[PDB]
Design a protein around this ligand. Sequence first.
Ligand code: GTP
Ligand code: GDP
Ligand code: MG
Lengths: 431, 432, 48
Amino acid sequence: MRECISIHVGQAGVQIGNACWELYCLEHGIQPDGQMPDDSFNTFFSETGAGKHVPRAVFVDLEPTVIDEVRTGTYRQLFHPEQLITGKEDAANNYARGHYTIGKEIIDLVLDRIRKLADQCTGLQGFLVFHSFGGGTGSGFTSLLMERLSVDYGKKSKLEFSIYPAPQVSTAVVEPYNSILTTHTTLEHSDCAFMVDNEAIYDICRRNLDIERPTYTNLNRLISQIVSSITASLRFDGALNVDLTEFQTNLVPYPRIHFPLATYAPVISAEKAYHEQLSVAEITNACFEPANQMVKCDPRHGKYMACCLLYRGDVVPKDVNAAIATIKTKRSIQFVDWCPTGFKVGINYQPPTVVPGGDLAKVQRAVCMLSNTTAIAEAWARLDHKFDLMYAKRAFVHWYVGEGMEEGEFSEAREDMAALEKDYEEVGVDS
Amino acid sequence: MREIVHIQAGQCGNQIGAKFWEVISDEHGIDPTGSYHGDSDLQLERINVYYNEATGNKYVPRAILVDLEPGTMDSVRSGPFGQIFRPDNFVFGQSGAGNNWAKGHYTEGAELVDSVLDVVRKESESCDCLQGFQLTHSLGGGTGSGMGTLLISKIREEYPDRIMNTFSVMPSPKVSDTVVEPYNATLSVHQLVENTDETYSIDNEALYDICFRTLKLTTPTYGDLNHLVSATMSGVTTCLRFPGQLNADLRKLAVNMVPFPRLHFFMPGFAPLTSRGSQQYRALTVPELTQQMFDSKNMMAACDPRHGRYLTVAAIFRGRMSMKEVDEQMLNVQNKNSSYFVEWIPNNVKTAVCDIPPRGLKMSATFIGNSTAIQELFKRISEQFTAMFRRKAFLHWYTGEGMDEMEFTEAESNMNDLVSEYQQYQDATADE
Amino acid sequence: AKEKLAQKMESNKENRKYQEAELLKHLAEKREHEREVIQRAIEENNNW
Ligand SMILES: Nc1nc2c(ncn2[C@@H]2O[C@H](COP(=O)(O)OP(=O)(O)OP(=O)(O)O)[C@@H](O)[C@H]2O)c(=O)[nH]1
Ligand SMILES: Nc1nc2c(ncn2[C@@H]2O[C@H](COP(=O)(O)OP(=O)(O)O)[C@@H](O)[C@H]2O)c(=O)[nH]1
Ligand SMILES: [Mg+2]
């Protein structure tokens, strides 16, 4: 019944996967061994003959290090060994190595494992793909896998949770190249993609959680909370829900304009105890503050095409509508002329769950706003400009060419990005 | 990506290589018998990058020791950590190279090369996932220089997809054992431009100047110079041998450091500067460590970084310090010294911090820079070369080995092109 | 989607196999010089 398969690619994807699955277990009362003493959780967890609950997920990395930590870790019994796939040689922050050279060896094995999970599904909805834009595996292997998934799965829904690179935490000079190459190749294969800018997450951890030097552990716990908010509607049956198809129908007006901006609230530090309880009005107001965004950009300089508000916990429809009405009186929120109905609201009964010993405080109510704004084009522009700086001099190009890539693939990828930026511009013009 | 195969060639190569192994063994808590006696799990986490685990608790360097002369090998075996090395891994000739690149590259070296490749193949086929090779040698001699570059070419033939890394020591008139060093160096530079993925340009001119001027050692010995080499080698390899995010393997380092194939010559830097005896010392804070990145006084290549521009920089901080302070200080230096970093390579300075400091120091900093100022080192070699070549002085030593004048003209022209290439990117602008 | 996948990979081996054989072509060329000089080294000598 309505199953969803989660694929975690590369270090970023695997590490975010660890955070997501830890949070899902806390939310559904599943122990780290898969034991549990609704029924919708079955969309994400299958059940074995021993009454154990197993994530409907595949973890893939071209290097074994990251995944070796999962198979030694607290949740080693949660996953069956066959769903934790590792190679020997990494993609060395090279899209060409991930996509071609190294990727081509493991691709068939990864798809065989995905096929085995799909065979356990009676009503497979589709896939959730987690990866970084910057790493060779996250970029190169993901686009290779996405292409192969379109072939094997027909017209099956594929949603992404993409880690947009940040210099505060960046590991490679070539991340703009890998980002553009993966976006070009994956664009025609993805139905909806939620970008997560590591700088936005880094700044929220610093500002809201008072963490001087945020680590991936800090970043992922926060990321996991947003992913859980998007997936709560699939894993639970509330008063107001949204399936794989309804997300896309409400937020995606055109094929290529499939990049919603996520905004989450409240993000409160586990200290204090006075900084709560926030009302529905207060958390809704926080969604329109650029400081709570998952991608750095300015919506006041762009136009909205769709706004989805996903509430969780002690929330009443009357409270929500009152909050939306006051926000509508703040003229500053501009929508495209071809869009009337701006607000689609969903309420899921379960209050946000937090990891014990975590940085996040337990709240009675939270909200995740998914908005399709033309302001997200600003994130593409930043990436495209960094690509252009290096590409004008063909700096580092030899690394890709050496692996069998052609220079033409770089031109093609960049022209496609130029067309994407042009698409966001065309969409914001009035008729 | 796991194992690195280390090769030591010639007098200099073996001397520096032996010191590298005693330094890193001490850091990884390995005694001269191969037994681990440390008390930190970080020491063993990535031990497999440089050591093979032999039967039981013992660790053996994945090192091949090469020379055309037997004496140096005997000196290594006799040494402090001499017993740690794999007996079968010592490959030595009887007929030396006599500080003649032609003997090392074409004659005597060619005769020994196959016996060396046989030992490197044994080590390589034992590997789960070979990253590549690391060669320590001098460019002024005959074995390290001529045979070393011959080995690079032969290894490249058999392992064309592995990373080729070198620690190449540049000759200097300040600490010269032969008048023909400019010829040997030029002939070797020609080979490295074409055959390595990354070369750490270790300049004896800079090492002598540091010892004499900074360490106040009136008469520096190779032991004094090698103490600086081993401190640098320990620093630049920190990322490969301890758990880390940045430049964790040879390929990732190369991919982040090398924008153009031929521009793979690194200018290493180190702070604080210490002398063998100096176990004092009481100094070095984070702002202090960071300031020495632009300090010509701290460069292992005799070039002023302020005479050029950095294409890419890797900076490794070691010891117990604030990661926040490091990030602030590093950003301050890039903002203050904007003009010494290329604008067309965004976020080109990458930093890593390792909790384990090197021996004797509580805090240290290692810099790996890909700077256009490295052209000063190559210009120096070209002018020394031309002064001799103009008069065809000592050419009989090379032609007598079967070499032709053209090879000399070609090596020189290739090296001048390399200088011209650094100058081209020094003058390049982000006008796009 | 089959000819887009196969043809992108047609160009991969066409490239990567050649871009490590353009390599070994000169690695032939320099050993073509090893004993082009080594024997010249005897034809100078076993000639005087
Ligand atoms: N949020 C987050 N970002 C991460 C994490 N790990 C890596 N990243 C980011 O992802 C990029 C680096 O790519 P990686 O995922 O580490 O690399 P990879 O996919 O394993 O690929 P290769 O190592 O080259 O084979 C940088 O922008 C990092 O900041 C993580 O746990 N969380
Ligand atoms: N730093 C350093 N340089 C050395 C050492 N021994 C020799 N050299 C230098 O290496 C060059 C001479 O080459 P050498 O390695 O002795 O000859 P080979 O045995 O034929 O490789 C000159 O530039 C010397 O100054 C040493 O132990 N340390
Ligand atoms: Mg990785």
